[PDB]
Symmetry: C5
Subunit: 114 residues, 5 copies
Amino acid sequence: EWTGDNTNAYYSDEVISELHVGQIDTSPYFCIKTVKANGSGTPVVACAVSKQSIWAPSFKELLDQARYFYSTGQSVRIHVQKNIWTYPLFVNTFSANALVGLSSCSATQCFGPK
Amino acid sequence: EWTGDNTNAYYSDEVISELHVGQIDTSPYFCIKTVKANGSGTPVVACAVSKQSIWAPSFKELLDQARYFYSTGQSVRIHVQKNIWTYPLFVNTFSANALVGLSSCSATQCFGPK
Amino acid sequence: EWTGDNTNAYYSDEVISELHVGQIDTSPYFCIKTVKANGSGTPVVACAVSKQSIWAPSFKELLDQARYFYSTGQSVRIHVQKNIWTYPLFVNTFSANALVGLSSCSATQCFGPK
Amino acid sequence: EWTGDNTNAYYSDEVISELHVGQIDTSPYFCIKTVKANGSGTPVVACAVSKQSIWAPSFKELLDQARYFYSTGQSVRIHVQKNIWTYPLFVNTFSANALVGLSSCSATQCFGPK
Amino acid sequence: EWTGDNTNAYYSDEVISELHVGQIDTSPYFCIKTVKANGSGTPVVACAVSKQSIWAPSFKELLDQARYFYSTGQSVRIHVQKNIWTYPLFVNTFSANALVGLSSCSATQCFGPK
Ligand SMILES: CC(=O)N[C@@H]1[C@@H](O)[C@H](O[C@@H]2O[C@H](CO[C@]3(C(=O)O)C[C@H](O)[C@@H](NC(C)=O)[C@H]([C@H](O)[C@H](O)CO)O3)[C@H](O)[C@H](O)[C@H]2O)[C@@H](CO)O[C@H]1O
Ligand SMILES: CC(=O)N[C@@H]1[C@@H](O)[C@H](O[C@@H]2O[C@H](CO[C@]3(C(=O)O)C[C@H](O)[C@@H](NC(C)=O)[C@H]([C@H](O)[C@H](O)CO)O3)[C@H](O)[C@H](O)[C@H]2O)[C@@H](CO)O[C@H]1O
Ligand SMILES: CC(=O)N[C@@H]1[C@@H](O)[C@H](O[C@@H]2O[C@H](CO[C@]3(C(=O)O)C[C@H](O)[C@@H](NC(C)=O)[C@H]([C@H](O)[C@H](O)CO)O3)[C@H](O)[C@H](O)[C@H]2O)[C@@H](CO)O[C@H]1O
C-alpha cells in the first residue's frame, strides 16, 4: 500500500481548520477538518486511529505533521482513504476517511503523489 | 469506550488557563484548568494519569494536545469523564474528572462530538 | 507518593531563570534554578535524574514542562522533595532537591497542591 | 557507513521548500524538496523511509531536523545517497535519493562533510 | 562519570552557531559548533553519537537541549570530553569532542559545574 495509490483520494489547496484528539476502543485518535484556502467547496474530514487500519504505523508521524500544518495554516494537499472507519456515531461526527498523507502546496504545485 | 459517549461530559468555548504536571503512585500525571473564553461561569478542572483509568492509552496525545492549546490560548471544547479519580487530597486539589478529549472551536461550532 | 504530599516543599510565584542538562552515573539529568518574580528570597535549585529516585517515571514530563515554563518566563509553583541526591560534588554545584512537580500561577493562586 | 562517505552526494546552500509525509509498505516516510538559495540550478528531492535502507535508524532525527529547517527557511547542505528507492511510481513522484544528513550553513561554509 | 568531572572541559559564554545531523555505523548522531558570544576566540565543535561512548544515554536529551539553545541564540556553557571519537574522516570534519552537557549563562555566571 502507498499514500499515492490511485485507490486513495486527495484534495489540494486546503487549509487545516480544526483539530480534535480523543480515544476510541482503546485507541488514541485524531481528526482534522480542512477547507479550501480560497473558501470554495465542501470541508474534508479525515481521522487517524492508533493501532487501527493498515495506516496505523504512520499515526504519530501524521499527528505531528497535522499539528505542524495546523499551526502554520499553510495550503496543503490532504490524502485519504475512503470508507475505513465503521463505528457509526464516530463516522457521523467525523467521517469514515482514514488520513493517509499530507503534502505542502507552496510553489507551483503540491509536493506529493498526483 | 469513546470520547463522544453521552455518559461523558463536555464544555464548549473554553480556554485552557492553567497547567500542572506531577506524579502520583509511580504515574506521571497532568491537570488542566479551563474557563469560558468570555470569562463567565465556573472553571473546569480535569486530569490524566499515565497508567490509570480506561483513558490511559491517550495520556501522551492528550498531554501534547493540552500543551499546544494552552500555548495558543484558542477556544476549545473539553471532554471529561466525571468521578474517575479517588485519591482524596488529589480530588480536593484538582477534581475527579478524567480528561478524555480536546476539540478546537470556531465562533459557530466545535469540531468534536456533542 | 504524590507531588502534593505534605512532606514535600513548594515555592510559589517563581520564574525558572536557568536550565542545565547533563549526565551522572549513566543517567541523563536536568536542573533548574528559580527566583521569586518580585526578587525577594533566595533562589531555589532542583534536579530530576533519569531512572533515579521514586520520581524517575516523571523525568521526561517535568523536563518538557520545565523547558516550556523556562521559555515563557511565566510565574510557577515549584514542588520539590528535599535531601534526595547524595552525590557530594553534584549537590554542591546544584542541590539535593528532587523536582517533583510544576504548576502555573495566576494573580491570586497557583494551580497545584499546597 | 557514514553520512560523509564520498559515495554519497551533497548540495550546499539549499532551502527546504516542500515537505510531504505518508506511508508505504507499512512504513511511515517523508520527502523534502530543496532549491538553491539564489534560485539557480534545479531542485533536489530526497526521502527517508522509517523501515527501509541502512539509514532507517536516523529517520526520526532527520524528520525533526527537516521540519525545523523547513520552518526557518535557512540555507542548508542536504546529504543524500542516490539510487536507493525502487518503487517506480514513488521514484517518479519524488526521487530515488535517500536522505542521509542535514547541515546548517554559515555565511561562507556549511557545517558538515564535503 | 559526571558532566562536571574536572577531567572534562567546558567553555563559557558561547552561542551554538551551527548544527548537523547524520548517521554513522548504524547510529544517529549530531554535532554542534559554538562561538564566543562576544566574537573572540576559537570555535568549539562537539558531537554526540546515539549508540557510542559512555555518554550515549543522554543523546536525546542533549539533542533536544542543543536544538533549544540553537533556536534561541542565548549564551551557554558547553561541556565536552576530549579525544572520544576516533574515525579519522569524522574527526577531521568535526572533532573528537563528545558533548556531555549544556548550561544556560547569565551575564555574571553559568548555571553548571565549573
Ligand atoms: C480530477 C477531477 O476529478 N476533475 C478535474 C479537475 O480536478 C481539474 O481542474 C483542476 O482541479 C484541481 C484540483 O484537482 C484535484 C485536487 O484537489 O488536487 C484532483 C483530485 O484528484 C480531486 N479529488 C477527488 C476525490 O476527486 C480534487 C477534488 O475534485 C477537489 O479538490 C474538490 O474540491 O481536485 C485544481 O483545482 C485546479 O486549479 C483545477 O484546474 C481539470 C483538469 O485540469 O479537469 C477536471 O475534470
Ligand atoms: C564537472 C564538475 O565537477 N563541476 C564542479 C563545479 O561546477 C563546482 O563549482 C563550485 O560548486 C560549489 C558547490 O560545491 C558543491 C556543493 O554544493 O557543495 C559540491 C558538491 O559535491 C556538488 N554535489 C554533487 C556533484 O552531487 C554540488 C553540485 O555539483 C553543484 O555545485 C550545486 O548544484 O556543488 C560552489 O557553488 C562554488 O561556488 C562553485 O565554484 C564544484 C562542485 O563540485 O567543483 C566542480 O567539481
Ligand atoms: C591560556 C589560558 O588558559 N588562559 C586562561 C584564561 O583564558 C582564563 O581567563 C578567564 O577565562 C574565563 C573563562 O574561563 C573558562 C571558561 O570558558 O569558563 C574556563 C575553562 O576551564 C576554560 N576551558 C578549557 C581551558 O578547556 C575556558 C577556555 O579557556 C576559554 O573559554 C577559551 O576561550 O575558559 C573568562 O573568559 C574570563 O574573562 C577570563 O578572565 C583563566 C582561567 O582559565 O586564566 C588562564 O588560565
